[PDB]
From a paper:
TRAF-interacting protein with a forkhead-associated (FHA) domain (TIFA) was originally identified as an adaptor protein that interacts with TRAF2 and TRAF61–3. TIFA has an FHA domain, involved in its binding to phosphothreonine (pThr), and has a consensus TRAF6-binding motif [PXEXX(Ar/Ac); Ar, aromatic; Ac, acidic; X, any] at the C-terminus for interaction with the TRAF-C domain of TRAF6 (TRAF6-C). Furthermore, oligomeric forms of TIFA promote oligomerisation and polyubiquitination of TRAF6, leading to the activation of IκB kinase (IKK). TIFA exists as an intrinsic dimer, and phosphorylation of TIFA at Thr9 promotes its oligomerisation through the intermolecular interaction of pThr9 with the FHA domain between the dimers.
Full-length mouse TIFA with a C-terminal His tag was crystallised not only to reveal the structure of mouse TIFA, but also to elucidate its molecular assembly in a crystal. Mouse TIFA is composed of twelve β-strands (β-1 to β-12) and adapts a β-sandwich structure. Electron densities of nine N-terminal residues (Met1 to Thr9) including the phosphorylation site, and 43 C-terminal residues including the TRAF6-binding motif (from Gln150 to Leu184 and His tag) are missing, which indicates flexibility of the N- and C-terminal regions in the crystal. The overall structure is very similar to that of human TIFA, except for the region between β-1 and β-2 (from Ser27 to Ser37 in mouse TIFA) with root mean square deviation (r.m.s.d.) of 0.7 Å for the corresponding 128 Cα atoms. In the region between β-1 and β-2, structural diversity between mouse and human TIFA is observed due to either a deletion or an insertion in the amino acid sequence. The overall structure of the dimer is very similar to that of human TIFA, with r.m.s.d. of 0.9 Å for the corresponding 256 Cα atoms. The dimer of mouse TIFA, related by a crystallographic two-fold symmetry, is formed by van der Waals contacts and hydrogen bonding interactions at β-5, β-6, and β-9. In the centre of the dimer interface, a hydrogen bonding network is formed between Lys108, Glu86, and Asp110. In addition, there are hydrogen bonds between Gln73 residues, between Ser43 and Tyr105, between Lys88 and Pro74 (main chain), and between Asn107 and Lys76 (main chain). In total, fourteen hydrogen bonds appear to contribute to the dimer formation.
Residue numbers in the entry:
A (entry chain A), B (entry chain A): 10 to 149
């Protein structure tokens, strides 16, 4: 019955009506152990969440959970895994292998993708969940 | 011919004459792609470097490469993966899922283990190497 921290991710893409997100399941919380590292990119064998797009690198970025000091809940860190295209966390540009700790609500922009991320705090630190929502509108 | 960043790790343990480091190869640089994450612990299937010790958690900690902003070389981040035992980076205690960016030279203490870490900068950012040395003396 222990609440689980969930990272709500509202995503958008102008060509999303082409099935770019066909590999992604929406409104479905997927439990991940705190040992796991969530990866995004076009490669199905390397990434848990994949996009059918040539402009997407094999691995675009990774999200990993961690505990901030003097905090009893899970937070998340992002790291750009793309040599080619940058990764915008709000107003900040993340080059190849740059990393940042994520706030509770932020916007991810890589290429033409737009991700709105919102962290809902739970009690558990052994696991976390992910949920996706598709936006018909652009996010900015 | 491109130089590769190497993390030199001098390790010590009072019971190291029992074969705790029998699974570890010394004076051998092992190349790792910058996508990899190096893990330490007793579990052979989850960790690349393993110790035959009940007091060692399944996964003790992880080392992952990243690029500091305004820097053209690889750096490393550590994250304690042990619920049970803390992880000392120099004078700092890292609890469960706490993380820190490593300096060029630091000391790792978990349980009765002692790791001296020294980063030798290379040119490559697509890969990094690891090398181990066993110390007959304690490190502090």
């Amino acid at each position: 019955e222990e609440t689980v921290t969930c990272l709500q991710m509202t995503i958008y893409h102008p060509g999303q009506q082409s099935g770019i997100f066909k590999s992604i399941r929406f409104c479905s919380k997927e439990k991940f152990p705190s040992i796991e590292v969530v990866k995004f990119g076009r490669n199905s064998n390397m990434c848990q969440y994949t996009f059918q797009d040539k402009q997407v690198s094999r691995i675009q970025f990774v999200l990993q959970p961690f505990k901030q000091f003097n905090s009893s809940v899970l937070s998340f860190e992002i790291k750009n895994m793309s040599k080619k295209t940058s990764l915008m966390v709000d107003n900040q540009e993340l080059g190849y292998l740059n990393k940042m700790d994520l706030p509770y609500k932020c916007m991810l922009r890589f290429g033409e993708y737009q991700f709105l991320l919102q962290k809902e705090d739970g009690e558990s630190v052994e696991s976390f969940e992910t949920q996706f929502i598709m936006s018909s509108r652009p996010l900015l």
